Write a protein that binds this ligand. Structure first.
Ligand SMILES: O=C(O)C[C@H]1CC[C@@H](c2ccc(-c3ccc4nc(C(=O)NCc5ccc(OC(F)(F)F)cc5)cn4c3)cc2)CC1
Ligand SMILES: O=C(O)C[C@H]1CC[C@H](c2ccc(-c3ccc4nc(C(=O)NCc5ccc(OC(F)(F)F)cc5)cn4c3)cc2)CC1
Lengths: 406, 406
């Protein structure tokens, strides 16, 4: 009979096959084959140490010598302040405007305090400073959501006053609040879907992933990105467009690989290990941002938590409390650009305003890729927009900081 | 409301997402970025020549100086002989056993003749010899199917004698036969599903793919695989197991990449370009052989044409004309191993019997991977079975030929 149907080839541009889970297994197996010996050497070297005990002892025996963990611990006072304000206005005190302005004061403090500290203290490491600011902005967003959720459910109980799952007031416990603090998400919500058990094997796999990709990224930086700069240690702040782009074209690809490894090490390994140590269940940290035939589809699927935050605490409100979805989304990108700048500049005491420029230029870039390319061609366009794109801004900052110091 | 469903992460081992078409676009864009300048230089150098005209002139002005195209042209006599036998026994001459033994003689000739020529003529290049043998084995399989299909439809017309689409006898035309000869498939069938038009853009894309990957593979060989041998030019025929494996571990990865590029350049670019020059429509040359959580699933999806051939001319018959599916599939692997050996050894006048050994050891390897691993773990096991696996046999042969001559 007819043993020749009229069809089209899999890889072909328009078959619509899309079942390539097994290309990634190839990437995994090649990475293992190509770095396994080195990783085993580095593990049998470093991992035999007593890292947790020695670090906690060396810290506790003399604090104030690392102001970054000092600051990370100091964030607890803002956490507790927000908890206390909520619990006070839970019974009826602090008429709603009072609680609102107390929350606003607390949040503005959470922002302006660690920045002021890292700016007016020289004995702090830029990596520790970045981690401190990261913790503080995560706390800012988490507490913003805490306030909004508690306000919503309180006004719901108020309207009901005109007449297993946890109800409104009985949730305000220290354990609940801290659990929300350390949970891999930015959207507060009672009754977080817990996971049944711990799955020690899964946990171990994720820790191994973290260690592996950490060592691999150290290797990438040391052996591919640093020498390319050491060959000409001259900052960008003084170069001209020609030399800037001539250097960036040589720096791009390794930067992009480092960025991909940041993603996989943080958004899938770290967060999963955390959510496993403390059964959290949800674990939708990212959608298929890769096969994204647009930019507005890339942002809606890279870093899910931040997306659903910007949506249900910053986009939907400014639509119900306003109009002009264009204005709203531009506000989203504006706030995110400010946050990027606050995140990268302040730890390095630079203000070149570059990351802001990149996040903002995303908008014309988005319209460009939307008007011109389509399909897999559009996906390639987005990949280009990622290789040179945004993650080159952080690279420019780190470049002009490294050449100026080493 | 509930904005936290209980789900699992995409990359995670058991979500079952599998929509990674866009990882491959990343591979494409990275390859372009990393080889585009070099490819444009090599194109602006070589492609300006007059390759077709000059080659046809230099051949036609003095034949017998390249016996490989001589032999490729000589295959036409076997093609015409099979055509003639079919047309004669179409009217009634050559009682079925006569036609059968004439076909058997013709096929045995198609096999034993080019081998004898390339074995008893020293002025032939090993690459040209390989191409000649490839053409002859393709012709062998195509004519085997031609015979079987014509026999089936003839006996169908015979049973009907006891009482738009093309019927049985009106197909035996030179144009039809030659069209089947040059069509990217091994299963003869009247009324091949034609494609509407030519799609010049598609054609150009495929030719560019061929040229690109050709230059890229030349680069791979010259700059990664050759020097690794030139550092120690000693044949395997004399080494010991230790040194053999010590060299193979260093040769494996580049070999595997060369093999992948063979696949993509031949099974998707070359065949598609051909089937486009001559609207053929079908274009199912391969199924998803990568994400293949087994070996028996890898073979059933790598090189579709050969699979459906072995099935509906060599497996199904030996099941209806026999039993013991185990015996049948072992016969399939035995014949394929003989064909591999005939294909690689004879052009190099070696007989180390290695490729046969690899194709045969696939069987215990298949049972191994089937019993032990599962899921993505099984897929990784198969990838390993491909990296060291079978495509190392051809590498051993080419190694022991190259060290002995250069
Ligand atoms: O039904 C059930 O459930 C059972 C099922 C069981 C198993 C199944 C079965 C088993 C084996 C094979 C089979 C074996 C060997 C083999 N080799 C090729 C091949 O790709 N050749 C390499 C090559 C290299 C170079 C080249 O180009 C150039 F020019 F370089 F030479 C062209 C090709 C394709 N094969 C297919 C098929 C099917 C039967 C039924
Ligand atoms: O779809 C409609 O309905 C229309 C409309 C709706 C709204 C939508 C939208 C949503 C979100 C964003 C947006 C913006 C910025 C942003 N940045 C992050 C991010 O993850 N990258 C920074 C980073 C994080 C961690 C990190 O780790 C460490 F530790 F190194 F710091 C390093 C860097 C996530 N973002 C998300 C923008 C727009 C647009 C469409």
């Amino acid at each position: 009979l007819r043993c020749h149907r009229l069809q089209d080839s899999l890889f072909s541009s328009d078959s619509g096959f899309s079942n390539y889970r097994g290309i990634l297994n190839w990437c995994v197996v090649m990475l293992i084959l190509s770095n396994a010996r080195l990783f085993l050497e580095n593990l049998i070297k470093y991992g035999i140490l007593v890292d947790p005990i020695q670090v906690v002892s060396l810290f506790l025996k003399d604090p104030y010598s690392w102001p970054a963990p000092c600051l990370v611990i100091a964030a607890n006072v803002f956490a507790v302040a927000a908890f206390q304000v909520e619990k006070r206005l839970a019974v009826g005190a602090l008429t709603e405007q009072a609680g609102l302005l107390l929350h606003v004061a607390n949040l503005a403090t959470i922002l302006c305090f660690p920045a002021a500290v890292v700016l007016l203290v020289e004995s702090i490491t830029p990596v520790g400073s970045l981690l401190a600011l990261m913790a503080h902005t995560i706390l800012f967003l988490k507490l913003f959501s805490y306030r909004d959720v508690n306000s919503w459910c309180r006004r719901a109980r108020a309207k009901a006053a005109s007449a297993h799952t946890v109800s409104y007031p009985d949730n305000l416990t220290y354990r609940d609040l801290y659990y929300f603090l350390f949970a891999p998400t930015l959207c507060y919500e009672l009754n977080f879907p817990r996971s049944p058990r711990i799955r020690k094997r899964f946990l171990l796999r994720r820790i191994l992933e973290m260690l592996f990709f950490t060592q691999l990224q150290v290797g990438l930086i040391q052996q591919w990105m640093v020498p390319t700069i050491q060959n000409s240690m001259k900052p960008f702040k003084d170069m001209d467009y020609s030399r800037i782009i001539e250097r960036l074209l040589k720096l791009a690809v390794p930067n992009h690989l480092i960025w991909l490894i940041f993603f996989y090490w943080l958004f899938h390994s770290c967060l999963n290990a955390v959510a496993e140590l403390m059964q959290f269940g949800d674990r939708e940290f990212y959608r298929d941002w890769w096969n994204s035939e647009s930019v507005t589809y890339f942002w809606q699927n890279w870093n899910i938590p931040v997306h659903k935050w910007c949506i249900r605490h910053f986009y939907k409100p400014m639509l119900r409390r306003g109009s002009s979805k264009w204005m709203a989304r531009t506000g989203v990108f504006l706030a995110s650009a400010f946050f990027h700048e606050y995140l990268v500049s302040v730890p390095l005491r630079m203000f070149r305003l570059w990351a802001f420029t990149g996040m903002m230029a995303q908008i014309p870039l988005a319209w460009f890729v939307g008007r011109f390319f389509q399909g897999n061609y559009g996906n390639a366009a987005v990949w280009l927009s990622l290789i040179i794109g945004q993650p080159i801004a952080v690279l420019m900052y780190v470049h002009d900081y490294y050449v100026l110091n080493y």
